[PDB]
Design an enzyme around this catalytic site. Structure first.
Site, short mmCIF file in Angstrom:
data_model
loop_
_atom_site.label_atom_id
_atom_site.label_comp_id
_atom_site.label_asym_id
_atom_site.label_seq_id
_atom_site.Cartn_x
_atom_site.Cartn_y
_atom_site.Cartn_z
CG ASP A 23 -1.81 1.27 1.33
OD1 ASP A 23 -2.82 1.44 0.52
OD2 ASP A 23 -1.62 2.16 2.19
CE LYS A 82 -5.24 27.76 -0.99
NZ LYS A 82 -3.88 27.84 -0.38
CG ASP A 115 -2.02 2.65 6.07
OD1 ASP A 115 -2.01 2.30 4.86
OD2 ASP A 115 -2.30 3.81 6.44
MG LIG Z 1 -3.17 3.33 3.46
#
Ligand SMILES: [Mg+2]
Ligand SMILES: *[C@@H]1O[C@H](CO)[C@@H](O[C@@H]2O[C@H](CO)[C@@H](O)[C@H](O)[C@H]2NC(C)=O)[C@H](O)[C@H]1NC(C)=O
Ligand SMILES: *[C@@H]1O[C@H](CO)[C@@H](O[C@@H]2O[C@H](CO)[C@@H](O)[C@H](O)[C@H]2NC(C)=O)[C@H](O)[C@H]1NC(C)=O
Ligand SMILES: CC(C)CCC[C@@H](C)[C@H]1CC[C@H]2[C@@H]3CC=C4C[C@@H](O)CC[C@]4(C)[C@H]3CC[C@]12C
Ligand SMILES: CC(C)CCC[C@@H](C)[C@H]1CC[C@H]2[C@@H]3CC=C4C[C@@H](O)CC[C@]4(C)[C@H]3CC[C@]12C
Ligand SMILES: C[C@]12CC[C@H](O)C[C@H]1CC[C@@H]1[C@@H]2CC[C@]2(C)[C@@H](c3ccc(=O)oc3)CC[C@]12O
Ligand SMILES: *[C@@H]1O[C@H](CO)[C@@H](O)[C@H](O)[C@H]1NC(C)=O
Ligand SMILES: [Mg+2]
Ligand code: NA
Ligand SMILES: [Rb+]
Lengths: 291, 32, 996
Positions: C349, C460, C690
């Site tokens: 990941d 911005k 995670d």
């Molecule tokens: Mg993750």
């Protein structure tokens, strides 16, 4: 996945032919070497022992005390009438005493007439092969009175009041030493304490000792034991066709149809006992003459 | 008599061997 | 009918977000500014369930204890105990004075299984126990507007269709449908993996509910700003709820180690029943009855069962798991300690696993030069040059013009891991100035801010003017930051080494290429400028109220750009390199944007520098992408939008022809589809994640790895291994140990399997040659469960013979834990020599005591008889029953001793599989103690007072101890020449036939 038997690319039972030959040749050479090594070491082991004496003899320290009817449970149960009930006993008695007949002990070059009276031990030199084949003292069946007879091929033994002879475990170089004249209460026995190994039978408890009425012992010249003139043993190689001493025991007054226990204990200094081995020194039997 | 073996001495030696080899192995696994 | 329920969960979600505010309020029946009446809220609360996922399925402790009492190895020992009691039942009713051996053995085998269960259970339970100490679920109350009033209630009391308000910092309770936002930015990292805080606007933007901005999600955190919304999904029906429910309802599979143990038992019982049956027929062909032959069949099969290999294998796995727990790499499943080594494809990941999931100042621009700042999580990298005037000006522009400040308890915490209040970009800037430029507290209060201008919705820009505390100039210091395209239009002067210069295109274009360099690198860049206001036109008393042009918008002095991105963790790139070195295919699987995923892939090692995608070649040749042959492209990026329209064969081809693959914008369900696609190839898969999106992927993977702190609870539970320290390098440690313990298990198995031959051979020739029993049963127990236990356990402590992180991952269809070479060694060659040594000691004892070996044939008939007390030996002596039995038992004891003596050599040769013992070395202290304890215990069992009574093991005459020495020396020499030919000749004979 379990049909790897064959293929068109040569495989049998899992591998090819040339691989089968390579592995088989390797295993044959390997196991052949293993066999040769085991044989060579076992040969060295054979070279570490002699032919006239076992290296270790401490595992037979107390000699045993066996009987002629090798019963399945040391029990003698039969019928005084039925001849087939006691066939298993008589068969073993005749086969055991088949080597003690006067015709079996006929050669004077291997047999020596010990004597009609138990004498001292007979030491025929050392245990080496420097001397020829030693002589074995004769033991005619006539010594066991009332349990030998002059019967035919079938020894007509005792139906009522049976016979049970006892034998001392043959041990090489063993010199039996009977108890001193200072006998520590050894159950009335004859005064021939110096040249015979005593053996006395009895019951086991207050019941068996009462049921067994009278016992009659028979031996060399009438002594209940083994004469010292037949010891020590010089191995099967130096003394083949050796006849160890025998001593019969007859139970005259028995309580028929009652299983009673008898303990024939051999006494002596060189005779040990064991609470684990009921045969070392002593001997047990369960007699029951059921009519 | 040859019908006797000093089993107590051999037994005692074997137990001493077993004790020493075990304490030595313990010193081996205790490298400090 | 749960199949359909799970299938409707493998599909990506649908929605009704694209609805006018009136159509939404009509469908749900809710006041857009007042919510609903509290009675209606409670009516729904008691209608469909509180806003919380259904708790996990509780696993009672007696269930997993019964689980540990079963399996595959313990099952073989169970069938062994059953066969023991079956043989004993056959022995009891049929013959007089049965032998109690079989009963003693059956109860011992049962005890072995039970104790192994107690130990393994205590270990797995300890892992889950220390896992429960990490659930720090703090209740979080939501701000709900009902009946026209604002109230803060528990998150579970929230229902469908009611107004909910969120503030920067608060967590999104349920799945909301935004109705009104005020510069609101949410954090979709734990759910969709989108790293940078994605803003949330009420207007529908994308057809995908995940990408659009009109939907807030369960478990997401509103970073900055405030917003309103109607609860569309609640409880388990939510996005992350359907993801978690899918995670729990997925299959675990069969670990590779378990499949290896199963195939191992297949071979164990295969040869066990072959020997038993062939000897059953052989015994019947000789003379023994069916009653006896059945006992022979059971005896030979039960004897060929490694009784202690269960406890040894368990302790082996436990030892490696201990080392895993030492490095804060806890494993929930015990056998999971081995799976990392057998892995050959790691799906990782990006957000939170490959990266730190935190905005960090990546690169800076000064003097037309790029300066890379240290972006490690623990600050262990190269520090840029911080002695120039351009830096002393840029650092003040950033430290002053920024709406970022530390909070209350932010004191003892480090400069990076501490919490910062405000924008993520401003947080990264504040941390970089507080880290490489002293402190921002006294640096911010040193320049008293007069008038500020926050970020604008269009163009911005963020500016502010401050007083100047320098002891040489009282002019006002004005600073401004913003997008580089907004600052280039309002700049004319350029700072360099302390002085100014015009906006010459020779260096301005050099600024543009730097902007596209830091931008194309997947980073977000900002521009910083400042100017000295003339104190003659704007004195110290004049107040520049924020209304009109009081500051010169143009003619400013540009100092430099400052880029930022979430950096990878410290040992992440090196670890990826180590995995690729071990032949592990690294594949990135994340839902983040591809422009950032590709950059992180090249930055960590998934995409090797030089390799080109199918698009990179079309860009280098200025030709359409439809022209280039994908075979000329080694690496490839696969977008989630395109992944939705893919077949099985197409994904198989994506993995087969592309070596470096990166899946971007992939949904959690697609992550699961990818893991399954990897498993279709037949390779071991490890998923490292995670967020909750990693739950269905960590579950279906052969082994899941969750981050111990930066991970979500669902993926942490659905995983099989936890990294309590988040040190991604632990993956490298795991793949190393998994191969290490694999090889050591091979060594230990061959050791326990070698002793079976000189254990069954006595009984075999006892049946064939009719000789007295050479080896006793209780003695066999004193070997398999006595002495050998410490050596076999010590065999786990062996180290690498060569570099294991260099060889390629083991092929599951080829490198089995127990192949046909180990059987040819243990049962074929070594165990055979040990059996011959035992029989040698046997014949020595019997021939020395009067029973010559040639005389031992056909002697067991009368030897085992309990009443024939006149058994002639070779010297004519008469032996009683107990006397000769004393010899047989005092003959079993040295056979056992002989086993230990040959096991000395067997342990030393099994310690090394290919290297020489001289090369490896007896440095294994546990093995040394194994031999010392083994020998001392064997001697104690023979010479302890009362052993010939309890265990019937009698003392030995010292010469017996040397009857086995030559066989051990032979074993050692043979295996040594074996490993020597393996070394010198690595071709095939000694290697493919004996090397196991
Ligand atoms: Mg993750
Ligand atoms: C052996 O058996 C015979 C019987 O055949 C016994 O002879 C008897 O002996 C008793 C004395 O005890 C005499 O009263 C009988 O008249 C004898 N009968 C016969 C037929 O001879 C003989 O006593 C037994 N021998 C021993 C030593 O007990
Ligand atoms: C042999 O044993 C019998 C017992 O079986 C003895 O005779 C018994 O003597 C008791 C008195 O003590 C009487 O009550 C029994 O009626 C007798 N039974 C028989 C059958 O006579 C006998 O005295 C014993 N004889 C010897 C020589 O020991
Ligand atoms: C191959 C070598 C290095 C192994 C070293 C251990 C050897 C030398 C040790 C291990 C066990 C030992 C034996 C242990 C038990 C007995 C019984 C004891 O009452 C006399 C010593 C004797 C006979 C030992 C002789 C030496 C011996 C064989
Ligand atoms: C090439 C060389 C090393 C091989 C020589 C073989 C040696 C190691 C073998 C051959 C025969 C073996 C011996 C055979 C006989 C005895 C007597 C016994 O009561 C103890 C074992 C003992 C002492 C053996 C020890 C090992 C031995 C001497
Ligand atoms: C009971 C036994 C029957 C055959 C013969 O009468 C000898 C008897 C005593 C010894 C006993 C065998 C039976 C198999 C054993 C348990 C078998 C065995 C031993 C150890 C083990 O783990 O598994 C099986 C081999 C011999 C065995 O121990
Ligand atoms: C033993 O003592 C008795 C007298 O108590 C005696 O008659 C006999 O001869 C002695 N025997 C020996 C061998 O001394
Ligand atoms: Mg076994
Ligand atoms: Na799993
Ligand atoms: Rb074994």
């Amino acid at each position: 996945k379990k049909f790897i038997w064959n293929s068109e690319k040569k495989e049998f039972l899992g591998r090819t032919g040339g691989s089968w030959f390579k592995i088989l040749l390797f295993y044959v050479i390997f196991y052949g070497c293993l066999a040769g090594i085991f044989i060579g070491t076992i040969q060295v082991m054979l070279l570490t022992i002699s032919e006239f004496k076992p290296t270790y003899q401490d595992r037979v320290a107390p000699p045993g005390l066996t009987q002629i009817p090798q019963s399945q449970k040391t029990e003698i149960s039969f019928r005084p009438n039925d001849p087939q009930s006691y066939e298993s006993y008589v068969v073993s008695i005749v086969r055991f005493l088949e080597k003690y007949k006067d015709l079996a002990q006929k050669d004077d070059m291997i047999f020596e007439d010990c004597g009609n009276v138990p004498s001292e031990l007979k030491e025929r030199g050392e245990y080496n092969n420097e001397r020829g084949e030693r002589k074995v003292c004769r033991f005619r069946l006539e010594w066991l009175g009332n349990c030998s007879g002059l019967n035919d091929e079938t020894y007509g033994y005792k139906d009522g009041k049976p016979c049970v002879i006892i034998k001392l475990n043959r041990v090489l170089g063993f010199k039996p030493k009977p108890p001193k004249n200072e006998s520590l209460e050894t159950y009335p026995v004859m005064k021939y304490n110096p040249y015979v190994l005593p053996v006395h039978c009895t019951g086991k408890r207050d019941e068996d000792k009462e049921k067994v009425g009278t016992m009659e012992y028979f031996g060399l010249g009438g002594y209940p034991g083994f004469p010292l003139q037949y010891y020590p043993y010089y191995g099967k190689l130096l003394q083949p066709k050796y006849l160890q001493p025998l001593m019969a025991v007859q139970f005259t007054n028995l309580t028929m149809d009652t299983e009673i226990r008898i303990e024939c204990k051999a006494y002596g200094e060189n005779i040990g006992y064991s609470e684990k081995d009921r045969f070392q020194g002593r001997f047990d039997v369960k007699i029951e003459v059921k009519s | 008599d040859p019908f006797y073996y000093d089993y107590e001495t051999v037994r005692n030696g074997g137990l001493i061997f077993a004790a020493l080899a075990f304490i030595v192995g313990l010193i081996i696994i205790l490298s400090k | 009918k749960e199949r359909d329920m799970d299938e409707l969960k493998k599909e990506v979600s649908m929605d009704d977000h694209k609805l006018s505010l009136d159509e939404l309020h009509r469908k749900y029946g809710t006041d857009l500014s007042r919510g609903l009446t509290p009675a209606r809220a409670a009516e729904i609360l008691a209608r469909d369930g509180p806003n919380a996922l259904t708790p996990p399925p509780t696993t009672p402790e007696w269930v997993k204890f019964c689980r540990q009492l079963f399996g595959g190895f313990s099952m073989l020992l169970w069938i062994g105990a059953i066969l023991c009691f079956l043989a004993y039942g056959i022995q009891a009713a049929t013959e007089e004075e049965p032998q109690n051996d079989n009963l003693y053995l059956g109860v011992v085998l049962s005890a072995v299984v039970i104790i192994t269960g107690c130990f393994s259970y205590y270990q797995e339970a300890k892992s889950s126990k220390i896992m429960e100490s990490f659930k720090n679920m703090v209740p979080q109350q939501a701000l709900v507007i009902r009946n026209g009033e604002k109230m803060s209630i528990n998150a579970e009391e929230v229902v469908v269709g009611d107004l909910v308000e969120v503030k920067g910092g608060d967590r999104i309770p349920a799945d909301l449908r935004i109705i009104s936002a005020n510069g609101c930015k949410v954090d979709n990292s734990s759910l969709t993996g989108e790293s940078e805080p994605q803003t949330r606007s009420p207007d529908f933007t994308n057809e995908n509910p995940l990408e659009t901005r009109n939907i807030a999600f369960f478990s997401t955190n509103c970073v900055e700003g405030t917003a309103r919304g109607i609860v569309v999904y609640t409880g388990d029906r939510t996005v992350m709820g359907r993801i978690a429910t899918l995670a729990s309802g997925l299959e675990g599979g069969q670990t590779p180690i378990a499949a290896e143990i199963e195939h191992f038992i297949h071979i164990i019982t295969g040869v066990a029943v072959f020997l038993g049956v062939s000897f059953f027929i052989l015994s019947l062909i000789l003379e023994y009855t069916w009653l006896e032959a059945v006992i022979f069949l059971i005896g030979i099969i039960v004897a060929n069962v490694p009784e202690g290999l269960l406890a040894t294998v368990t302790v082996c796995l436990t030892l490696t798991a201990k080392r895993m727990a030492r490095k804060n790499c806890l494993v929930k499943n015990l056998e999971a300690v081995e799976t990392l080594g057998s892995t050959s494809t790691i799906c990782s990941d990006k957000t939170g696993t490959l990266t730190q999931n935190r905005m960090t100042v990546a690169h800076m621009w000064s003097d037309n030069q790029i300066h890379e700042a240290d972006t490690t999580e623990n600050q262990s990298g190269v520090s840029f040059d911080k002695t120039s005037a351009t830096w002393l000006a840029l650092s003040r522009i950033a430290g002053l013009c920024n709406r970022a400040v530390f909070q209350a308890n932010q004191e003892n915490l480090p400069i990076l891991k501490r919490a910062v209040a405000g924008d993520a970009s401003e947080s990264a800037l504040l941390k970089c100035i507080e880290l490489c430029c002293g402190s921002v507290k006294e640096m911010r209060e040193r320049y008293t801010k007069i008038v500020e201008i926050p970020f604008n919705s269009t163009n911005k820009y963020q500016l502010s003017i401050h007083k100047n505390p320098n002891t040489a100039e009282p002019r006002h210091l004005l600073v401004m930051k913003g997008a580089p395209e907004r600052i280039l239009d309002r700049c004319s002067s350029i700072l360099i080494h302390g002085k100014e210069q015009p906006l010459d295109e020779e260096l301005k274009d050099a600024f543009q290429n730097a902007y596209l360099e830091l931008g194309g690198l997947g980073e977000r860049v900002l521009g910083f400028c400042h100017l000295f206001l003339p104190d003659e036109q704007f004195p110290e008393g004049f107040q520049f109220d924020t209304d009109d042009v009081n500051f010169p918008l143009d003619n400013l002095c540009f100092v430099g750009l400052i880029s930022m991105i979430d950096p990878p963790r410290a040992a992440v790139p090196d670890a990826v390199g180590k995995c690729r070195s071990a032949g592990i295919k690294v594949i990135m699987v994340t839902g983040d944007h591809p422009i950032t995923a590709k950059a992180i892939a090249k930055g960590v090692g998934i995409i090797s520098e030089g390799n080109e995608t199918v698009e990179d070649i079309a860009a280098r040749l200025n030709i359409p992408v439809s022209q280039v042959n994908p075979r000329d492209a080694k690496a490839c990026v696969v977008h989630g939008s395109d992944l939705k329209d893919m077949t099985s064969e197409q994904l198989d081809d994506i993995l087969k022809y592309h070596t470096e693959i990166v899946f971007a914008r992939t949904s959690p369900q697609q992550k699961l589809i990818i893991v399954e696609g990897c498993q279709r190839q037949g390779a071991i898969v490890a998923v490292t994640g995670d967020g909750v999106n990693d739950s269905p992927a960590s579950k279906k993977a052969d082994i899941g790895v969750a981050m111990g702190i930066a991970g979500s609870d669902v993926s942490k539970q659905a995983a099989d291994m936890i990294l309590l320290d988040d040190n991604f390098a632990s993956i490298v440690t795991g793949v190393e140990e998994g191969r290490l313990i694999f090889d050591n298990l091979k060594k230990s198995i061959a050791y326990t399997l070698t002793s079976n031959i000189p254990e069954i051979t006595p009984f075999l020739i006892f049946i064939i040659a009719n000789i007295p029993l050479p080896l006793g049963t209780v003695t066999i127990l004193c070997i398999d469960l006595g002495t050998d236990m410490v050596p076999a356990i010590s065999l786990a402590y062996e180290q690498a013979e060569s570099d294991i992180m260099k060889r390629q991952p083991r092929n599951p269809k080829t490198d089995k834990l127990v192949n046909e070479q180990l059987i040819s060694m243990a049962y074929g060659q070594i165990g055979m020599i040990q059996a011959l040594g035992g029989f040698f000691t046997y014949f020595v004892i019997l021939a020395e005591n009067g029973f010559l070996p040639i005389h031992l044939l056909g002697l067991r008939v009368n030897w085992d008889d309990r009443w024939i007390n006149d058994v002639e030996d070779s010297y004519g002596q008469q032996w009683t029953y107990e006397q000769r039995k004393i010899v047989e038992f005092t003959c079993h004891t040295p056979f056992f001793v002989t086993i230990v003596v040959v096991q000395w050599a067997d342990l030393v040769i099994c310690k090394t599989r290919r290297n020489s013992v001289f090369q490896q070395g007896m440095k294994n202290k546990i093995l040394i103690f194994g031999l010392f304890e083994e020998t001392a215990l064997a001697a104690f069992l023979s010479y302890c007072p009362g052993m010939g009574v309890a265990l019937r093991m009698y003392p030995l005459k010292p010469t017996w101890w040397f009857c086995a020495f030559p066989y051990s020396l032979l074993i050692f020499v043979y295996d040594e020449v074996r490993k020597l030919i393996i070394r010198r000749r690595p071709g095939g004979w000694v290697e493919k036939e004996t090397y196991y």
